[PDB]
Amino acid sequence: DLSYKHAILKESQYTIKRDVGTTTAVTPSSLQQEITLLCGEILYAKHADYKYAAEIGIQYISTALGSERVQQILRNSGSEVQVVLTRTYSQMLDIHGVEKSWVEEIDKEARKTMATLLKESSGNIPQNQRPSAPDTPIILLCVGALIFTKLASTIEVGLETTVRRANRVLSDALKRYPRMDIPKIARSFYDLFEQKVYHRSLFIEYGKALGSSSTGSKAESLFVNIFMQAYGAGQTMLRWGVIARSSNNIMLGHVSVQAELKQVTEVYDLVREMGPESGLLHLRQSPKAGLLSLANCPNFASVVLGNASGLGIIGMYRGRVPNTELFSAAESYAKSLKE
Amino acid sequence: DLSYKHAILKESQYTIKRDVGTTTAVTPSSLQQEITLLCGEILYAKHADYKYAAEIGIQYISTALGSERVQQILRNSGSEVQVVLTRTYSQMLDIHGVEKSWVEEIDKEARKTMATLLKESSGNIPQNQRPSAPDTPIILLCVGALIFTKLASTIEVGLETTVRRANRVLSDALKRYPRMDIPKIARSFYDLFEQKVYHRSLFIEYGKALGSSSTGSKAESLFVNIFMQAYGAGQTMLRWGVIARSSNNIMLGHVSVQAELKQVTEVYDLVREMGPESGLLHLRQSPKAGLLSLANCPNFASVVLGNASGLGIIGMYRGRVPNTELFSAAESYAKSLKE
RNA sequence: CCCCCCC
RNA sequence: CCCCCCC
RNA sequence: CCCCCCC
């Protein structure tokens, strides 16, 4: 059945159309040196409103890939959003859907903070501490990638995890910019990813275009590391299933587990059939996701969760254990094997 | 014989003609923003009559796919129903076959409820609690998809299951709209699916056009999840047969089971021959369904039902057990293997 | 005739 | 319906 | 995020 369902979904002669009357903003590569400034003036000043930081990160992505490539990416993502270009005025940027009041506020706040830290201090600002640093857009996109790995999770868990992991992953940027509010920027990125779902596809295309590069700075290598940490998002049950098989859990040989193993292997075969893009299904909110669910094998899922709980892997996972006796037996065996 | 029967049914040079003098209603995409309102004014008010909620969900489907694509879908489903377009009047909708009194009643009831909940309360209605929310048509179609998975079952079982599953599947919508009557909407959808059988084909085409989409909201992902839960409808005996084979039931090696295994494998080969569209045969009430029946293998069916009963899968399945001795032996072995 | 559980 | 830990 | 010794 599962192969037939995927065959129906894949073999479609008709293309969906959505967001027909909508538009979005991009910034041409000719403005990259400008957007960098903006992407850094968000980082070293303490701003009251961090509402469009995610849009500025996506603007930098658009400068990197190019306006035409970004339009093509949005078009092949199933969304008929018409790209609107970015202009300059007196210079500053007039990004579509980003209020000019916001851009002026961010610029003025950063200029005032820079003046205050230059007047009082000894005037020895290093090359990495200024807003026009060239890795500041990647530093913002690193907060974006941290909150990207938690798009399958909830908002509160995502924000808490983003802040906790960014105090260590982004320690160097925090030292360079003492006053960068990872919570508010992470909230902005979560809002962008939820509202504009095609920007998930744009962000993934940037991740690919960055990982495929021949050279990169440490910021881009960090961004790619986090982006790849997001790969199996929304499918931790499959990873824990292969973990359970590697652990040689005895309760995998139970009668009901052996009964469901056929369709479990069917799900894994479907994973292989989709191939490399299967991992990005839940990150993209591809409607085709959910063909990879193991919820139709309650006993296998309970055994997998029990094995994870025994090994300590389960952590604070919020999934359901359908069959509690199998869960407890598997947990006991996994603890025994671990000890 | 079974391959020959399918060859006769498939190799037909003549097309059937039905519903020749009949007509049905569609709504053009230009009215989607309007139909959404209607599809949500059914959800947050307590209506005396929920008679045409299913037709309003199908109207939203018609806006999504388009009027011309919907006409083509109805034509290729074997039904010569002439599509009638939807108009507006003073604005509200005049849907063909939907009485204007009903639309006026629903709109007035929703407006009165909104006025009552705005006058008494503190006036802090969130963006998701209002009728013009853009996921309300998908919320109605989710009740429709829940009752869709029970079209092979009976009406009472379908309604009971729809309400039971919708208290959990649709918990968030229920929180957003405290007064949405899943029983009456489910009854309306069951009535639509029984009366207009071509709307099963339309609803399946919407499911495909939604699953094939590159992006979607959580409502559309939920709808696709339920729609795929409906895939093997009307053929639980085949699923339980492959379950029995996976369980390695000893009574499958009995003399009579081994006698019938040849034509059983013939049925499964026919399943593979039809391919992806085989699962939707009973959902569509395709007359070609019934070639997949295992009723001509009473001993295999009894063994399969016994295995299911032993594993606890049988639940409250109402199929017949032809050979009770095989059923009991298979149930005993399945319980023994499970323990 | 067929279908019939749970998710 | 699905998802849900850590890195 | 990754890396981190010796030759």
Numbering used by the authors:
A (entry chain E), B (entry chain C): 10 to 99, 112 to 360
Sentences from the paper on this structure:
The viral genome is encapsidated in a sheath of oligomerized copies of the nucleoprotein N, forming a ribonucleoprotein complex termed nucleocapsid. The nucleocapsid is the template for transcription and replication by L, which is also dependent on the obligate polymerase cofactor, the phosphoprotein P, together forming the active L/P holoenzyme. In oligomerized and RNA-bound N (N-RNA) the nucleic acid is threaded along an extended groove in between the NTDs and CTDs of laterally connected N protomers. An important function of the C-terminal domain of P in nsNSVs is to bind to assembled N-RNA, forming an N-RNA/P complex.
However, 11-mer oligomers (black arrow), 12-mer oligomers (white arrow), and short coil-like segments, denoted as spiral particles, are also present in the preparation (red arrow). Finally, 3D-reconstruction of the spiral particles yielded a coulomb potential map at an intermediate resolution of 4.7 Å. The map density of the spiral particle shows N protomers forming a spiral staircase and stacking up upon each other, in a mode reminiscent of a helical assembly. The map is most reliable in the central protomers and becomes increasingly disordered towards the outer protomers. As the map quality was globally too limited for atomic refinement we restricted ourselves to rigid-body placement of N-RNA protomers. We were able to rigid body fit 12 protomers of N into the map. Thresholding of the map at a low level indicates the presence of additional N protomers, however, this density was too diffuse to fit more copies of N, presumably due to heterogeneity of the sample or conformational heterogeneity. It is notable that in this arrangement the RNA strand is obscured by N protomers belonging to the next turn of the assembly, suggesting that a conformational change is necessary for the genome to become accessible to L/P. Taking together our cryo-EM reconstructions, we observe that the lateral interaction of RNA-bound N protomers can support a range of geometries, demonstrating the plasticity of N-RNA and supporting the notion of a highly flexible HMPV nucleocapsid.
